[PDB]
Design a protein around this ligand. Structure first.
Ligand SMILES: [Mg+2]
Ligand SMILES: [Zn+2]
Ligand SMILES: [Zn+2]
Lengths: 15, 114, 392, 56, 133, 266, 31, 147, 65, 46, 181, 49
């Protein structure tokens, strides 16, 4: 429903 | 700029009395009290207590316009009962109800351990 | 200043704060909003020019306008919405509040009316205590839909000696109507007596509504699950009724209407179906919306909104149009590059399948914006054109 | 612009906002505006007394 | 002062219809056949189900500013469960003998068919409706 | 014991959860009002700015200084300058606090509630101490500074009530609720299908017995029993927001009797 | 997976890359 | 004005105690009229508010982006998960009496903008003042002490 | 500009809660939802206060005097 | 930002250059235009 | 976006793949693969209105690329991917809008003119217009004391830098009839 | 700050993009009902550079 900004945490934990 | 002073809400002016008791012409044993520098806090509370009086035939209040902290309280009573006394009693009744609430909240807080 | 009424004479009330304050019922003749509107005040200087203002152009005199031989002022917004609410069979008032609602009427004879209900609990009706603002000798009679003297639906209006006997008070009664409660009170009791009534009705109704409250939310646009199923289907069957005609015309079987091209004939049928569709879909939501629906409640009093507003928000927005016709192929044989060529479909020529609640598609959004812009221009152009018409 | 229409003295203008506690025929005038606009009242035995108070 | 109509009725139907706190009743007189009754009732205070048996009374008493009954004991015709107050607004001649009267109790309407209560029911504002059982 | 009773559910430094019973709604509501509106507190009211090199405007800072909570326990010992006898202010009617901060650090330098200094003489009463509630003991962050960024100002804290400025608000939101099962039919629940399923249950639904379908509507019923929760800002301890609330409302009603008496002299 | 189809949520990684390069007044500057 | 062509001026300012309230103790900063919605059909204003409530309660930054897969029924499910009546209504109590309003109000956060027209920059009155040289008629404009 | 002292709507002091909010996010690796709640910002009026605040002062400070 | 992405269509009048053309799709904003004299003549780039 | 028949594998699929998407996000997280990289890799193209006349664009990629061999009632009613001749795909339909209308939350849920009015009002608004406002000596300027970012924003606002320099506050609003004021 | 403007004697100036009909373009238009001309083929020929 909301805008996901936690993509710094997601891209750091995936790359 | 055209804004009235904030304290004008609660401080009586030059020759302003808290109460102005004028008699109602339309009905017998009826009066109209104009409370100055007061609002719903006091109005609704007094009006309500007056309704508990069996000898009180009519009780209502109105803040005629919000820009001004003042209200009109109309009291009508049964014969041989001064509406002034009706209000005097209604007030005493409120104070005594509050005193009870103070001494009981005090009681309960002095029972709590936080 | 397009009216006699765009300039009226008023009684000064010196107040605090930097805005000119006006009674809401005088909003209509001025054509004023509080969307940030400003107004001019002109002070007369002669004992003679004041007399002119007071005796010839004061608001109470200006009440029943000669433009339409009807009153140009009535009850509006909160007071209109709340008056319907107050004057229901279902609506009853406990003593505590009856006494406040009486005191609030500045004229009130000091006589507490005998309650409609006595024995179980002294309760007054909305109708009852509103009739305290209605002056004696005011006699009104109106029949709506199927109103009988035993008004089953609480239809019509029956005021006798200035007392409401039956019927809900809404736009037809307390508005700026031809047989108005206002139109009658003026003609019968005086423009002065009538101006007082504006205030009295307001003072009561507004007070009652302050304490009852009124709102609107997304919930009020939400129509029933099965009712939505019924709408989706209605739109669907209309789309198919359109295709059936679209293939009929492509197979050269479609016969042209007298004085109309095959194209003119086909397009007429299409836009007739797609409109029939929007109307039916909306009428489904309209019916399915409960009496507790805040949008329906405003539509009912007549305070704001109409069917099309409900229809478009809840069920289906409908076909978009520019220059009398469905969105034309601005591109070579297509309305947008997102479509194939020679696509006459409801979807291609701008039929907005969706409601405002559901949200428009990108195509729907643009076609809506195309027709929308035509509005803004036409308005701009008419404001100009009518300006000069008035002056000449 | 100068004859069928004129800009005029004893005139005021501000934002309007509606009030449920004014009577139909009243108009709320901000104190500042009331304090600027004037009426030329002639000193007569009727007002002589009031008028000296306003001047005071 | 005293009563103008008294009869016991049998509720044939009770109807709300878009109304939460009020219902329109339909009842035939137990005693007289020529008599019928339609009446709106605050079913929140006085509930009525179809097949109920009710005594219905019309009295001229028991201008005047309503006084709250804070008055300990008073002489009301309070020997009834639900009481209303309204105005007679229509006098209908439906046929020879057969006549109907319309009463509004602050919007809550009522129509009463019959024939005999001629020398009783007046176009009188003064009309208290009283119901028991 | 006597008349309207109280039953405290939960208590902390900042919140009182309680059940007020045998009271009339008007009384419960008036007490609610008084608690926000008319209980006196001490708040910075005059800010004399000596020097300001901050990124922040003189008055922006002045306004924040107002909203900072100050000790108002012994606020009765302080006088209202309005009715004090001094030219402007004195120790009987005001608390003077100085704030002096300079960006000594190469990093950002902070200015806090803790950085205020009482310069006036407190006459030994608990007043004017800026309320610190955080873990680190810094309080409110007034503003931030660079290097040459300086802020020298003087404050005059005065007795006041929320009707003059909400800065003298001793309480934050007051929780107020009655009749969780809408037994009084004081509200008409908006719905789509079922009013019960759609409208969430109250916490206080526990503390009151449901009505049961079979039971008819009780018209006799009156609203007594009000579930409440008073939250203090920190100026006055929560208990005293309730007690001073009761007292202020009492003194208010009292003043009317007194006024009614002066009237019956002439 | 390396050359798998794109989601609509992926559009924003391209849109983000657009402005990261162009800016919002690209037209004025380039001209 | 809201971001939905919903402009308006202030009428009155009421303090916290005169204002209506949630049992929770929350009070509005703004009170806009129900009437300003049907004629206008600013459904997005309503959705803004619903989503914004959820966002505040959840510590999110709600996506009000146009061509999304976000629905009112979706947002509602989340708001009821947070303990509120799914469609944003809230039981409110009248500030003067403390009595529950019969109505349930659509209460929630909404982004409002402060517009550049302040009343005290517009207010103007004149009773004799500067006149034009040529026409000997009043001058133009608030600044110039115009008529 | 800088974290408002107190919530506009209810007046609960949110002046202290800034640095602490930011540490809950950064160091504790908490989400905004639990962070606001740990600081005890219960009603959404108070949540919107901190949650939606833009601390521009930090940008302004970057300029020379 | 909006001002630096503005467009002026000099004309002159009321007609067809004011309306939102199909071809304006994703080049010019369908909603942003002034009301009145410049309605549709002052376009705004997408 | 360029859509070609390209890979023998399946149908007509979009030139850009999940690989390029992460390749771009590597450079995004860095603050080597730019917008220019997509342009010279020929996965993205520039199309004017005259060229637009020869192409066929899909709105969404995913919702407009495979083919049929339940559905959410709440969602809006969409069209079809029946075209096997797709040449290009739209990056995002919300890119039809410009700066002003991009600040409008859910404009697809409003009547078209209401959006045109809010497009005009955002100019009459107030907030931080630049961070150097203290240093500037403008004829007039207004700065909102405590600007708040909006609770509901568009994916577009990220590029408009709205969250950094806002133009309003999140007010607790009640849509109610109260005093009639 | 984004640039794309000029500082002229102190004030920031925006050069507003001016719409024009493209040159060197063949366009055939139908002439109005009373005209002694049925249709016209127009070309706005000008040197681009
Ligand atoms: Mg306007
Ligand atoms: Zn002193
Ligand atoms: Zn708060």
């Amino acid at each position: 429903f909301i805008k996901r900004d936690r993509m710094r945490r997601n891209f750091l934990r995936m790359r | 700029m055209n804004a009235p002073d904030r304290f004008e809400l609660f401080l009586l002016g030059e020759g302003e009395s808290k109460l102005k008791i004028d008699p109602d012409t339309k009905a017998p044993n009826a009066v109209v009290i104009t409370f100055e520098k007061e609002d719903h806090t006091l109005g609704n509370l007094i009006r309500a207590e007056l309704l508990n009086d069996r000898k009180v035939l009519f009780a209502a209040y109105k803040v005629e316009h919000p820009f001004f902290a003042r209200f009109k309280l109309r009291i009508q009573t049964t014969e041989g009962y001064d509406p002034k006394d009706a209000l005097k009693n209604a007030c005493n009744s409120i104070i005594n109800k509050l005193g009870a609430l103070k001494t009981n909240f005090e009681t309960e807080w002095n029972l709590q351990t936080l | 200043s397009l009216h006699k009424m765009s300039m009226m004479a008023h009684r000064v009330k010196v107040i605090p704060y930097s805005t000119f304050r006006l009674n809401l019922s005088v909003t209509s003749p001025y054509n004023a909003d509080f969307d940030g509107d400003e107004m001019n005040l002109h002070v007369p200087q002669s004992e003679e020019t004041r007399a002119e203002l007071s005796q010839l152009c004061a608001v109470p005199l200006q009440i029943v306008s000669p433009q339409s031989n009807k009153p140009c002022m009535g009850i509006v917004q909160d007071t209109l919405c709340g008056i319907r609410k107050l004057t229901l069979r279902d609506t009853f008032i406990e003593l505590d509040q009856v006494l406040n609602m009486l005191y609030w009427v500045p004229d009130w004879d000091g006589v507490i009316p005998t309650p409609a209900i006595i024995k179980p609990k002294p309760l007054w009706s909305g109708k009852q205590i509103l009739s305290v603002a209605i002056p004696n000798g005011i006699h009104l009679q109106r029949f709506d839909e199927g109103t009988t003297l035993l008004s089953p639906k609480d239809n019509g209006m029956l005021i006798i000696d200035g007392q409401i006997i039956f019927g809900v008070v809404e736009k037809k009664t307390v508005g700026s109507s031809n047989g108005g409660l206002i139109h009658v009170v003026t003609r019968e009791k005086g423009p002065q007596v009538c101006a007082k009534l504006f205030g009295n009705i307001q003072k009561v109704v507004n007070f009652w509504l302050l304490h009852n409250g009124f709102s609107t939310g997304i919930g009020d646009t939400i129509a029933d699950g099965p009712t939505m199923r019924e709408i989706t289907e209605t739109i669907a069957e209309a789309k198919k009724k359109v295709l059936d005609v679209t293939k009929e015309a492509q197979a050269n079987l479609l016969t042209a209407k007298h004085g109309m091209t095959l194209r003119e004939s086909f397009e007429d049928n299409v836009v007739r179906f797609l409109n029939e569709a929007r109307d039916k879909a909306g009428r489904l939501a309209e019916v399915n919306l409960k009496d507790l629906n805040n949008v329906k409640q405003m539509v009912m009093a007549g305070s704001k909104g109409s069917f099309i507003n409900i229809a478009q928000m809840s069920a289906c927005v409908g076909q978009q149009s520019v220059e009398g016709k469905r969105i034309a192929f601005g591109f070579v044989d297509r309305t947008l590059p997102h479509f194939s060529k020679d696509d006459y479909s409801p979807e291609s020529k701008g039929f907005v399948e969706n409601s405002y609640l559901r949200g428009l598609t990108p195509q729907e959004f643009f076609f809506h914006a195309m027709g929308g812009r035509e509005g803004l221009i036409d308005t701009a152009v008419k404001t100009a054109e009518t300006g000069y018409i008035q002056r000449r | 612009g100068n004859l069928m229409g004129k800009r005029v003295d004893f005139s005021a203008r501000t934002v309007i906002s509606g009030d449920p506690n004014l009577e139909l025929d009243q108009v709320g005038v901000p104190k500042s505006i009331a304090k600027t606009l004037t009426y030329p009242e002639v000193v007569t035995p009727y007002n002589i007394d009031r008028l000296t108070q306003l001047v005071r | 002062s005293n009563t103008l109509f008294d009869d016991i009725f049998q509720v044939s139907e009770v109807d709300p219809g878009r109304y939460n706190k009020v219902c329109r009743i339909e009842a035939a007189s137990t005693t007289q056949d020529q008599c019928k009754l339609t009446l709106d009732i605050n079913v929140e205070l006085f509930p009525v189900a179809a097949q109920d048996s009710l005594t219905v009374t019309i009295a001229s008493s028991l201008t005047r500013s309503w006084r709250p009954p804070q008055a300990g004991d008073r002489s009301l015709a309070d020997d009834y469960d639900y009481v209303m107050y309204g105005t007679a607004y229509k006098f209908e001649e439906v046929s020879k003998d057969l006549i109907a009267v319309y009463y509004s109790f602050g919007g809550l309407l009522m129509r009463l068919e019959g024939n005999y209560r001629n020398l009783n029911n007046l176009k009188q504002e003064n009309a208290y409706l009283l119901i028991r059982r | 014991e006597e008349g309207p009773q109280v039953k405290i559910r939960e208590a902390s430094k900042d919140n009182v959860d309680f059940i007020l019973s045998n009271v009339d709604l008007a009384m419960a509501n008036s007490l609610r009002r008084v608690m926000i509106a008319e209980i006196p507190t001490l708040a910075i009211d005059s800010v004399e700015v000596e020097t300001n090199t901050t990124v922040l405007a003189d008055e922006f800072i002045a306004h924040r200084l107002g909203l900072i909570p100050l000790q108002s326990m012994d606020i009765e010992q302080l006088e209202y300058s309005r009715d004090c006898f001094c030219e402007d202010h004195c120790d009987k009617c005001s608390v003077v606090l100085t704030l002096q901060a300079f960006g000594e650090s190469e990093s950002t330098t902070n200015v806090y509630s803790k950085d205020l200094v009482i310069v006036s003489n407190l006459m030994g009463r608990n007043i004017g101490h800026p309320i610190i509630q955080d873990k680190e003991g810094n309080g409110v962050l007034i503003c931030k500074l660079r290097k040459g960024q300086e802020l020298k100002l003087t404050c005059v804290a005065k007795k006041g009530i929320a009707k003059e400025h909400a800065k003298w608000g001793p309480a934050a939101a007051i929780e107020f609720e009655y009749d969780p099962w809408n037994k009084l039919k004081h509200t008409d629940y908006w719905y789509e299908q079922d009013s019960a399923k759609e409208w969430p249950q109250s916490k206080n639904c526990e503390y009151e017995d449901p009505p049961n379908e079979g039971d008819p509507f009780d018209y006799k019923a009156q609203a007594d029993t009000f579930y409440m929760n008073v939250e203090s800002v920190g100026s006055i301890p929560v208990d005293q927001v309730v007690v001073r609330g009761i007292d202020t409302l009492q003194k208010k009603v009292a003043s009317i009797l007194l006024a009614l008496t002066q009237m019956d002299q002439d | 997976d390396e050359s798998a189809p794109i989601t609509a949520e992926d559009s924003w990684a391209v849109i983000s890359a657009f402005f990261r390069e162009k800016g919002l007044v690209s037209q004025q500057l380039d001209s | 004005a809201s971001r939905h062509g919903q402009k308006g001026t202030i009428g009155i300012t009421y303090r916290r105690e005169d204002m209506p309230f949630t049992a929770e103790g929350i009070v509005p900063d703004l009170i806009i009229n129900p009437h300003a919605i049907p004629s206008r059909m600013t459904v997005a204003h309503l959705i803004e508010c619903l989503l914004s409530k959820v966002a505040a309660l959840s510590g999110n930054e709600g996506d009000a982006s146009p061509f999304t897969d976000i629905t009112v029924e979706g947002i509602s499910k989340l708001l009821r998960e947070h303990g509120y009546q799914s469609r944003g209504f809230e039981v409110m109590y009248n500030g003067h009496t403390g009595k529950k309003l019969m109505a349930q109000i659509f209460f929630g956060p909404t982004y409002y903008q402060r517009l550049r027209h302040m009343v005290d920059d517009k207010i103007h009155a004149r009773a004799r003042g500067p006149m034009q040289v040529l026409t000997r008629q009043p001058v133009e404009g608030r600044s110039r002490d115009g008529g | 500009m800088i974290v408002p002292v107190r919530c506009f709507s209810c007046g609960k002091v949110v002046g202290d809660k800034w640095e602490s909010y930011l540490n809950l996010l950064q160091e504790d690796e908490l989400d905004e939802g639990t962070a606001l709640s740990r600081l005890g910002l219960k009603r959404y009026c108070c949540r919107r206060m901190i949650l939606t605040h833009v601390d521009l002062i930090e940008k302004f400070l970057r300029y020379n005097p | 930002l909006s001002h630096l992405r503005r467009t002026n269509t000099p004309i002159g009048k009321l007609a067809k250059p004011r309306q939102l053309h199909n071809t304006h799709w994703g080049l010019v904003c369908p909603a942003e235009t002034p009301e009145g004299q410049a309605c549709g003549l002052v376009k705004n780039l997408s | 976006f360029i859509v070609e028949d390209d890979e023998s594998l399946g149908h007509k699929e979009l030139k850009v793949r999940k690989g390029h998407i992460a390749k771009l996000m590597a450079t995004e997280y860095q603050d080597e693969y730019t917008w220019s990289s997509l342009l010279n890799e020929g996965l993205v193209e520039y199309i004017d209105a005259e060229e637009e006349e020869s192409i066929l664009i899909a709105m969404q990629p995913e919702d407009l690329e495979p083919a049929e061999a339940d559905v959410d009632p709440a969602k809006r009613i969409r069209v079809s991917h029946h075209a096997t001749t797709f040449t290009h795909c739209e990056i995002h339909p919300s890119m039809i809008l410009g700066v002003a209308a991009s600040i409008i939350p859910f404009p697809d849920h409003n009547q078209s003119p209401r959006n045109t009015y809010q497009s005009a009002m955002g100019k009459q608004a107030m907030g931080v217009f630049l961070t150097n406002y203290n240093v500037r000596m403008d004829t007039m300027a207004n700065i909102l004391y405590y600007p708040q970012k909006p609770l509901g924003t568009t994916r577009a606002m990220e590029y408009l830098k709205f969250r950094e320099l806002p133009a309003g506050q999140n007010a607790i609003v009640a849509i109610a009839c109260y005093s009639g004021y | 700050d984004m640039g794309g403007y000029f500082i002229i004697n102190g004030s920031e100036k925006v050069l507003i993009a001016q719409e024009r009909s493209a040159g060197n373009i063949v366009q055939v238009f139908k002439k109005a009902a009373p005209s002694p001309i049925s249709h016209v083929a127009e070309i706005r020929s000008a040197l681009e550079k």
